[PDB]
Amino acid sequence: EDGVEDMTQLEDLQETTVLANLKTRFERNLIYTYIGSILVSVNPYRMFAIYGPEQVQQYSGRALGENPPHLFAIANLAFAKMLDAKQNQCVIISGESGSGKTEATKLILRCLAAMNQRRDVMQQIKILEATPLLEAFGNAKTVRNDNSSRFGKFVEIFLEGGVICGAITSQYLLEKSRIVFQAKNERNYHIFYELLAGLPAQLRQAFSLQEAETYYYLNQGGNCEIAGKSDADDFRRLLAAMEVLGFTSEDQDSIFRILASILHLGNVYFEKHETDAQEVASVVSAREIQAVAELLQVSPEGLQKAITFKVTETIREKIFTPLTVESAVDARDAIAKVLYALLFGWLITRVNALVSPKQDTLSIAILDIYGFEDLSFNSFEQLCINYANENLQYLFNKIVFQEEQEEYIREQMDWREIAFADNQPCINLISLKPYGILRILDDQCCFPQATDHTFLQKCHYHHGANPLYSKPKMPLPEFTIKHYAGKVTYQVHKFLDKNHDQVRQDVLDLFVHSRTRVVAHLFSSHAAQTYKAHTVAAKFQQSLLDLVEKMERCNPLFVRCLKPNHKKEPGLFEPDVMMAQLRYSGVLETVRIRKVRLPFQVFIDRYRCLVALKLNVPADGDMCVSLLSRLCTVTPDMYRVGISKLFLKEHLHQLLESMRERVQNRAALTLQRYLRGFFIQRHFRSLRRKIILLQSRARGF
Amino acid sequence: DETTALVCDNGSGLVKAGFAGDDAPRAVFPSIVGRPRHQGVMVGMGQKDSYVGDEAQSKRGILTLKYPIEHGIITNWDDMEKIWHHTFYNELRVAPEEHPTLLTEAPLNPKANREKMTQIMFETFNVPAMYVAIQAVLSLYASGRTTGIVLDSGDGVTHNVPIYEGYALPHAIMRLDLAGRDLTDYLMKILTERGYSFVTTAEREIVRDIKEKLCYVALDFENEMATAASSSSLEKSYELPDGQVITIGNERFRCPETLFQPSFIGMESAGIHETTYNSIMKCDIDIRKDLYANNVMSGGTTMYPGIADRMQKEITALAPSTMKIKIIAPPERKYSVWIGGSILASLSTFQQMWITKQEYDEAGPSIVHRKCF
Amino acid sequence: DETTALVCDNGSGLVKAGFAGDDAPRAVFPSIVGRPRHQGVMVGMGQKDSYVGDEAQSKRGILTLKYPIEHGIITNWDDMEKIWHHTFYNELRVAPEEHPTLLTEAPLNPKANREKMTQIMFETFNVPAMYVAIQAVLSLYASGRTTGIVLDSGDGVTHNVPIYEGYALPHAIMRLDLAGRDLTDYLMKILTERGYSFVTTAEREIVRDIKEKLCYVALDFENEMATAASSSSLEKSYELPDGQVITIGNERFRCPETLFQPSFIGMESAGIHETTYNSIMKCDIDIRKDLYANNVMSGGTTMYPGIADRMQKEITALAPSTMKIKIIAPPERKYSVWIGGSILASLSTFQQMWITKQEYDEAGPSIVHRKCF
Amino acid sequence: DETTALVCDNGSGLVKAGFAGDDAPRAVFPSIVGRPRHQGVMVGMGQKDSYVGDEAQSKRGILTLKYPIEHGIITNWDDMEKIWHHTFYNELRVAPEEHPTLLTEAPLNPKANREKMTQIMFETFNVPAMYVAIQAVLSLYASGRTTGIVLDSGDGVTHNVPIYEGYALPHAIMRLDLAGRDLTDYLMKILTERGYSFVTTAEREIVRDIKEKLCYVALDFENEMATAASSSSLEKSYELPDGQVITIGNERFRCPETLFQPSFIGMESAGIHETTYNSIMKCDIDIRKDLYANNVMSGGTTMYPGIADRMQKEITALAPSTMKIKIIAPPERKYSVWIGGSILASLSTFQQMWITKQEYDEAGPSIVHRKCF
Amino acid sequence: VFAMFDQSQIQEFKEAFNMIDQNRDGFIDKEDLHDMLASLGKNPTDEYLDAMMNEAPGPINFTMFLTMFGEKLNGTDPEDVIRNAFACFDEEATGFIQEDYLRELLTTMGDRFTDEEVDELYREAPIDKKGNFNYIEFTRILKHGA
Ligand SMILES: Nc1ncnc2c1ncn2[C@@H]1O[C@H](COP(=O)(O)OP(=O)(O)O)[C@@H](O)[C@H]1O
Ligand SMILES: Nc1ncnc2c1ncn2[C@@H]1O[C@H](COP(=O)(O)OP(=O)(O)O)[C@@H](O)[C@H]1O
Ligand SMILES: Nc1ncnc2c1ncn2[C@@H]1O[C@H](COP(=O)(O)OP(=O)(O)O)[C@@H](O)[C@H]1O
Ligand SMILES: [Mg+2]
């Protein structure tokens, strides 16, 4: 009931006021708030079957000024804008893990499918079935969530003349460092544990997978049973969906073979064994690599020479080089990461090809993206996540400033001159070409005799004078970057081991000649589709650039999601949690964009006493700007009051309020002394003017 | 605008080039300019009057082989310009005006060499930026180290450069003019003891191939001479390009020993082990410990089987008996300098140390003496 | 609000710091500021342009060692500020704005030294309170005594301070500029007699290590010179950092004898025994008895084996034959001053003798001359 | 029995000898021992297997030049014995057993050097008496003075000795190992910038001749570098012994500047002006006045035209602005030490300060440490 | 100041003063009033004479006399200032000030007044039923006279 749909119209905009408004609306069982172009949603933990097909006709765009703020208004807004400007656009779903992003995606897909009266007839267009599969491949347990999206899910819904066509799915920012490394109290991607829990026996005797609890790629977390809510039933339903997608049993068997090969490669160790002139490397146990070779249809000596020897090959000769232990570990990790990435790309490509729509058609975009992260201790993955969120926050700030500018121009022409300060310096601090932090890290990757301390020292040197950089006082292995969401302190522990994604051409050549068809096809396709680099940061930056280009090809308009207390309590929340989520989402920056915004009727009404405005019903033509000068001698700096009413700036506003309360204090003192004078003058009449006459009568007769 | 910078290790006898960021040179061919000498009789086949390295390798029998680079210094400038033009256009098929280029040089080379190299590579090919780097620092870059003495021994020069934690000691740099080409000439002069005569340039390169495929360095010289002239176990046979079989005896290992005994050619200098020890003893004591512990090799002419063991034995005999000598002999002694140059040119922090065209145009060619080394 | 006050004995050649109430200094490292001198060739390793004491110890071979404190007085103020910042942040990891600090000083040092020390430690580090204490009174505190003459002989100064029951005699304080660094320089100059040449700063510190590990003081000089140049029993060998073995003969004990015979360096002053006797004979007779009976030592340069016996013999030869001379030589001659400072800074009655920030701000830096000593 | 005592100034690179009482050395020749290295083919001309200085100068092309004296200390004793025998018999034609001999030495030389010198000159040549005198006191004798600092800079050592009215200050003697031979080596290493290669010993001596005949010291370095690389006015040409003409530019004056800037060779020491100023500031104030007023020079390597003016400018910049610096540059900087030795050996009051044969036989060689200096 | 004086009420001031401040230190006693009124004599009675005064203002002095006469009420309580002060809490032209509004204005801001003072106002304030006190008649009667 309590609408306050547009908080721009209030006297002042503060995070406290916004939090109070959201609390009031949540207590009113209202989730969505229509902040002009932007929308805000909160996870209710409450199953709301809002209406049904009728809501499209009930919450259409014809009465946006009176319609309640709802998520499904954008469904009609998209069509209304594309039918007018003749330009497709994109919609992003952003928010921290567990904020109902998948629920919002399902709701918007249902609304778009239900608006054309055709989905009932062509429901065979098999679109959303694989969402749990891409979830199991792309989600993993974090210290704050048991289901966290760790990849930039992208679903493209195609349209042609109002007819909903097929869809194309893609991944952008998958973190490859999770497969080999994982922090404490977290674990790897969910599907490894699902496979190990739902493993049938025939795979147990055939594939050596009896060490499901002692794999190095999995035991790193220290506790893999915290996710005990998941079980082998997830594996069974995953297999049911996998068969639904038209995959033969051979494809599933090959996928399990590759996953088992990756898990076995996780359990490979090296020894600092002596050699001709140095101590380089030696494989501890050959039975494990032999078993890897048996189930991969590839020579074992190929793997030995690809993970132990470095191949420098020219036209006239090919030279083998012994490798150090760290280099061998990096090569093994690169092999595992590239195998996992190729599996994901293959599955995404096949899913897209199954329901591939027509080409050269219209298209609406849905983007599932990361959330801003600030843990107790932060690592490389958090840095990449923060960089991506910084780029998206830059885009959001651009959109907000565009809306402010168009509103200002809609009021009067001449306020397009108002400027705006962006977060470009932070983006340059992160990844500018000459001396960016990621560029320094990439240089340190290949630089000889490098360690974490040297990288930290170089970062400290090159960014000492940067206002956003913050050198720690104590000699600590940390640094602090000022993001838009606040200060974040990273730890430089193990960055150099999270970037050595070097895959020499000999490994790809070995995997092309594999006897199995799927692996050979995947590596041949990878070599055919392939300028590039050889670090995780560089690939992440390339994918981020591709995503930014795809977004700028269309018009960005999206929605943010917030989360109440993470104890799964419906209808109850902590205001501090709201403040934290509001800071992390980035909607707080709108207040900074406001910089002024105050009305005119307030001046009309409650600013007349100062000169004791003699006249009544003042119009807009009343001497107003000079009025302040005649009462405070302040030069005309308010943008313009007029009818176009967003003029009063913050510090002058507080000065005016202080002056008002001071005037009220003086008026109250005057009233008090006036009442005291009246009381004493009553006292004066009483004791003589109505008593002496009575006494005259008493003495009289 | 991503543009990979070319790395062109134009050594003294072989040109090794490629793009930065690779793991091996894209193109390897001898730096030879060939010109026909006989008279052409067939009308039409008298137009190709100059063959660059590999083509001149294929047609040795009807033309003369001239090396533009003699003992490090660039003698014939037109031939070197032809080689650069070939390796830019006909070999990599990459326009040089869109890619920065990196070049290597001996430590104690003349200055007019650098000035003319910069002038040619800025005026002719119009390269946006270029840089000249000493070969030893690139060898250390490729070896993945920061301390130790680099013994870079190409076929034109053999020089030592002591480096400790990135700070070079320029007063301990020693350079010898004894290199692989002089070994080839000694092999030509020492093969006449068995009757084989090699006089022309093609026969000189046949002798070079013999040296590459048969020569080795022994641990002890007197013992191996006695063994050679006490049996036929060390004799090996080689087949000339006309099916004529030659046999080599004690000449197999007496060709590369002149590196340790340069009195065979008559030079007054000392062997490479002695120069390395003297270069160490020109450095500070705290420097000397790590220089002892971290000897490294590079260059083609250090690929003889048994070089590392003998030079280790000689350094250990020279150095005090309580120190540990460990000589690094990676299997990429050839084109280790190119691997180091590729690593160096791929660094994003290196972008500010180029020589931009504006800098050269405003300050002249002398800045190559200021921004290098 | 319990806050332990830091005690930072910034001596002339070594910085010994820690918290008050401990029994040994937390951090000990030389007070050296090192700067590289050669040219950097590896791109990236050219940023660390100043190494503080221990890091500069590790990298002697590529940089120059400069001592900010020369003969007690602070010469280079920026280097000393760097050393203080290092020992506060990178060594103890304790913010200096939350802990009071105690500093030591020679007795007869200039006054601008104290004024600038207070100004730096109040304006830069914003220490809540600081104090400057003479080293001899802290040595007496650490020795658990209240009478006697302190012979504090660091590597920058050697001074005597007679104290009787807590009342210092400021007219009997004698100070000599002959200390350990001059002994090291004499050892450098006297080692050339055998052919060993030490010129650089790193070689000077190698000589310092030789002095610490081999030198001793003999009871009789002529007898020991005859013994040394009559046999090889006193010869000892030392190993330089490159495995080169050196042999030392009569130079072993002729280095620390200049303390008793400062004419070797050419100084006109007298030995430490003579200065101690003259300082006693500048005091009252009743004072003189207890000063005779309670000689005490401190400072690093009094750790030579045999110093106590010889100085006892010399004082006994100087003093009247009926008095008892007893020289205290505790095994903590090094950082006895720090132990005394830690004892002094931990007293709860000392809380009122600090120099609070309000006092310095209202009266200026001159109060360091009023509240000290 | 009148017997003139021989004076044999056996310096580090040249031997200058003669009789006492003359005004110039009778014999001057380099101190080089040459040995042939090639193979003799003519039967009969294979007997002269060692050529002493001047003969080895005449036949540089077929033999190796070795200096017995390296940086002051006598390295090879047999070669030095051969040089002494030559300069006694084949050069002066005077039997050494009938004449006393006087020898010179660096100040801070080792002691075994003196002991072996006395042993050789008493046992082999059977000289009746000999004496070893420091070169600086002889330079002061020859200059006709009694005060001032001697800057004796040969080709093996450069040392300062402050003397005031005949009383030496042995604690202010400074010695540097930077001398003329290191200047020659720097010239060899710096001539490669123009393409001239000098590697052998004969080429090293050709470079030495170039240094003697062309090098000079400028007043200002930056101005002269700009002038050199702004015109061709400073370029001079030299003719090698085969008619090949070489041209020298800014290398003409950048060779002898390392005396004032010894960082070019990498030495950590300071220039000769700085060492002279520091040696003065190690002396007393009343001494300092006359040391300022009476600087004197000697040694060959101080004959560069313009050395006096620059060192005067540098001392004046270092010394207080009110004092008068007057540097004595007599035109006999070469063999001034010999003139002083001849004056000293001709004094009749010197007859009692020899080292007689009976004294050496009864007390052993150690008396050379007692009767000298 | 007395330079500008409203003689209509100066007579009231002088009467009240000469009845309160007389040729004595400043103390006001029953003796002065009783004498000046009925010094001739009245027989004593106690019908309503067991409680006379309980809220004495304070001490009196001739210097304080002149200062208070000049300052307190001489030509004060201007009608325009009265309208201004009373409307400062009001936007309506008619001056409807809700009685509760003034209740919190007096008992919540500035130095606090008591509900007894509010009643004192109400016992003499003409207020409509809804509680919107007006003050035009207040000013009229205050300025008119007694
Ligand atoms: N395997 C080998 N064994 C012996 N010598 C070799 C070998 N390979 C190359 N060389 C010698 O190295 C010389 C040059 O090799 P390299 O150092 O690669 O080129 P550059 O000297 O131009 O850098 C050739 O003259 C050749 O004689
Ligand atoms: N065991 C030792 N034997 C001889 N000399 C020593 C010994 N330990 C230290 N020294 C000398 O003491 C000097 C300084 O020591 P110390 O007094 O602890 O520092 P500071 O002089 O700064 O107070 C050093 O120069 C060193 O030469
Ligand atoms: N005219 C000159 N100009 C420059 N240098 C000279 C000249 N004459 C001699 N020298 C240098 O002086 C060095 C030795 O000269 P001298 O002092 O006479 O002999 P010694 O050093 O043995 O006493 C030689 O190495 C030579 O380079
Ligand atoms: Mg090479």
E87 and E67 in a single domain? The answer is no
Q: How far is CA A468 from CA A471, A502, A591, B234, C239, in A?
A: 10, 32, 20, 71, 52
> What string of H, E and C letters represents the secondary structure of A110-138?
HHHHHHCCCCCCCCCCCCHHHHHHHHHHH
For residues B198 and B188, the answer to whether their CB atoms sit within 8 Å is yes
One of A135, A186, A194, A373 is an active-site residue; which one? A373
Which amino acid, one-letter code, is at B207? V
Q: Which residue has the tokens 């701000």?
A: C361
Ligand 2 atom with the smallest distance to the CA of C334 is 18
At which of E26, E48, E72 does a domain end? E72
Which amino acid, one-letter code, is at A122? M
Tell me which residue of D257, D262, D254, D264 sits closest to D307, measured CA to CA. D257
Helix%, strand%, coil% for chain D, nearest 5: 40, 20, 40
Q: How far is the CA of B97 from the centre of ligand 4 (A)?
A: 26
Q: How far is the CA of C13 from the centre of ligand 2 (A)?
A: 8
Residue E1 lies in a domain: no
Nearest alpha carbon, ligand 1 atom 22: B11
Structure tokens belonging to residue C194:
């055998």
E59 and E83 in a single domain? The answer is no
Cα separation, D220 vs D309, whole angstroms: 10
Residue E118 lies in a domain: yes
The ligand that comes nearest to the alpha carbon of residue C187 is 2
Nearest alpha carbon, ligand 3 atom 8: D300
Tell me which residue of A485, A454, A696, A465 sits closest to A584, measured CA to CA. A485
One of A142, A149, A169, A170 is an active-site residue; which one? A149
Q: What residue ranges define each of the domains in chain C, with the CATH number in brackets? A: 4-32+69-132+335-371 (3.30.420.40), 33-66 (2.30.36.70), 134-179+269-330 (3.30.420.40), 180-265 (3.90.640.10)
Cα separation, D37 vs D61, whole angstroms: 10
Give the burial string for D244-257 (b: 16+ CB within 10 Å, else e): eeeebebbbbbbbb
Q: Which of A663, A664, A692 sits opposite E37 (nearest CB)?
A: A692
> Per-residue DSSP letters for B305-319?
TTHHHHHHHHHHHHS
Tell me whether residue A222 is one of the annotated catalytic residues.
Answer: no
Q: Which of C42, C48, C89 sits opposite A473 (nearest CB)?
A: C89
A644 is in an annotated binding site: no
E59 and E105 in a single domain? The answer is no
E60 and E97 in a single domain? The answer is no
Cα separation, A469 vs A472, whole angstroms: 10
C-alpha triplet D366, C253, D163: angle, nearest 5°: 60
Q: How far is the CA of B348 from the centre of ligand 1 (A)?
A: 32
Q: Map out the domains of chain A as residue ranges.
A: 601-648
Residue B183: which residues within 8 A CB-CB, separation 6 or more?
Answer: B211, B215, B255, B256, B258, B259, B301
Ligand 3 atom with the smallest distance to the CA of D155 is 21
Structure tokens belonging to residue A649:
């700036």
Cα separation, B318 vs D259, whole angstroms: 32
Q: How far is the CA of C69 from the centre of ligand 2 (A)?
A: 15
For residues D319 and D230, the answer to whether their CB atoms sit within 8 Å is no
- For the purposes of burial, counting CB atoms within 10 Å of the CB of A437, is it exposed (0-12), middle (13-18) or buried (19 or more)? buried
Question: β-pairing, A89-95 with A362-368?
Answer: parallel
Number of domains in chain E: 2
Q: Output the furthest CA–CA distance in chain E (Å, rounded).
A: 59
Query: What residues make up the domain containing E111?
Result: 79-144
**How many Cβ atoms from other residues are within 10 Å of residue C191's Cβ?**
19
Tell me whether residue A102 is one of the annotated catalytic residues.
Answer: yes
For residues D193 and D251, the answer to whether their CB atoms sit within 8 Å is yes
Structure tokens belonging to residue A499:
């970037």
For residues A354 and A77, the answer to whether their CB atoms sit within 8 Å is no
- For the purposes of burial, counting CB atoms within 10 Å of the CB of C273, is it exposed (0-12), middle (13-18) or buried (19 or more)? buried
Taking chain E, what is the end-to-end CA distance rounded to the nearest angstrom?
23
Cα torsion E14, E20, E25, E31 to 10°: value is 130
CB contact under 8 A, C89 and A447: no
Q: How far is the CA of B102 from the centre of ligand 4 (A)?
A: 14
The single-letter DSSP state of residue A274 is B
Question: β-pairing, D101-105 with D6-10?
Answer: parallel
C345 Cα to chain A: minimum distance (Å): 25
Which amino acid, one-letter code, is at D150? V
Taking chain C, what is the end-to-end CA distance rounded to the nearest angstrom?
28
Cα separation, A343 vs A341, whole angstroms: 5
| Ligand 2 pocket test target in C12, C105, C155 with most atoms within 8 Å of CB | C155
Tell me whether residue A299 is one of the annotated catalytic residues.
Answer: no
Tell me which residue of E124, E142, E141, E143 sits closest to E133, measured CA to CA. E124
Which amino acid, one-letter code, is at B146? T
A100 is in an annotated binding site: yes
Contacts C200 to D, Cβ<8 Å: 268
Q: How far is CA D52 from CA B250, C149, D46, D64, in A?
A: 39, 68, 16, 11
Tell me whether residue A170 is one of the annotated catalytic residues.
Answer: no
Site residues for ligand 2, CB cut-off 6 Å = C 11-14, 154-155, 180, 208, 211-212, 299-301, 303-304, 334
At which of E27, E44, E72 does a domain end? E72
Residues paired with residue A470 on neighbouring β-strands, in sequence order:
A480
One of A94, A148, A169, A391 is an active-site residue; which one? A148
| Ligand 3 pocket test target in D12, D14, D178, D253 with most atoms within 8 Å of CB | D14
Determine E/B contact with 3+ CB pairs under 8 A as the test: no
For residues D148 and D141, the answer to whether their CB atoms sit within 8 Å is no
At which of E55, E72, E89 does a domain end? E72
Cα separation, B222 vs B214, whole angstroms: 20
In terms of CA atoms, which chain B residue is nearest residue D65?
A: B268
Cα separation, E14 vs E8, whole angstroms: 11
A98 is in an annotated binding site: yes
Structure tokens belonging to residue A339:
């195998």
Give the burial string for A323-332 (b: 16+ CB within 10 Å, else e): bbbebbbbbb
Cα separation, A585 vs A393, whole angstroms: 9
Taking chain B, what is the end-to-end CA distance rounded to the nearest angstrom?
28
E78 Cα to chain A: minimum distance (Å): 11
- For the purposes of burial, counting CB atoms within 10 Å of the CB of C339, is it exposed (0-12), middle (13-18) or buried (19 or more)? buried
For residues D73 and D117, the answer to whether their CB atoms sit within 8 Å is no
Q: How many residues does chain A have?
A: 701
Residue A465 CA from chain centroid, whole number:
29
> Per-residue DSSP letters for D256-311?
GGGGT-TTTTT-SS--HHHHHHHHHTTS-HHHHHHHHHTEEEESGGG-STTHHHHH
The ligand that comes nearest to the alpha carbon of residue B212 is 1
Q: How far is CA A189 from CA A21, A148, A235, A544, B223, in A?
A: 39, 10, 13, 22, 66
E121 and E98 in a single domain? The answer is yes
Tell me whether residue A644 is one of the annotated catalytic residues.
Answer: no
Cα separation, E109 vs D151, whole angstroms: 95
For residues A67 and A59, the answer to whether their CB atoms sit within 8 Å is yes
Cα separation, D327 vs D292, whole angstroms: 9
Structure tokens belonging to residue E5:
């004086």
Q: Where are the alpha helices (DSSP H) in B92-134?
A: 111-123
Taking chain D, what is the end-to-end CA distance rounded to the nearest angstrom?
28
For residues B228 and B250, the answer to whether their CB atoms sit within 8 Å is yes
E85 and E29 in a single domain? The answer is no
Cα separation, D185 vs D67, whole angstroms: 14
For residues C334 and C355, the answer to whether their CB atoms sit within 8 Å is no
Positive or negative CA dihedral for A580, A583, A587, A588? positive
Cα separation, A524 vs D71, whole angstroms: 70
DSSP E strands, A497-597: 555-556, 559-562
Ligand 2 atom with the smallest distance to the CA of C69 is 22
> Per-residue DSSP letters for A475-498?
S-SEEEEEETTEEEEEE-TTSGGG
Positive or negative CA dihedral for B319, B320, B321, B323? negative
E16 and E47 in a single domain? The answer is yes
Residue C285: which residues within 8 A CB-CB, separation 6 or more?
Answer: none
Residue D57: which residues within 8 A CB-CB, separation 6 or more?
Answer: D29, D30, D32, D205
CB contact under 8 A, A433 and B348: yes
Helix%, strand%, coil% for chain E, nearest 5: 50, 5, 50
One of A302, A371, A436, A586 is an active-site residue; which one? A371
Contacts B109 to D, Cβ<8 Å: 192
| Ligand 3 pocket test target in D10, D15, D155 with most atoms within 8 Å of CB | D155
Cα separation, D56 vs D31, whole angstroms: 10
Residue A240: which residues within 8 A CB-CB, separation 6 or more?
Answer: none
Three-class SS of residue A200? Answer: coil
Q: How many residues does chain D have?
A: 373
For residues B156 and B179, the answer to whether their CB atoms sit within 8 Å is yes
Q: How many CA atoms within 13 Å lie on the side-chain side of A462?
A: 22
Determine D/C contact with 3+ CB pairs under 8 A as the test: yes
Residue E117 belongs to domain with CATH number: 1.10.238.10
Chain B interface residues facing chain A, Cβ-Cβ under 8 Å?
2, 4, 21, 23-25, 28, 140-141, 143-146, 308, 326-332, 335, 339, 343, 346-349, 351-352
E113 and E98 in a single domain? The answer is yes
Contacts C27 to A, Cβ<8 Å: none
Contacts C37 to D, Cβ<8 Å: 263, 268
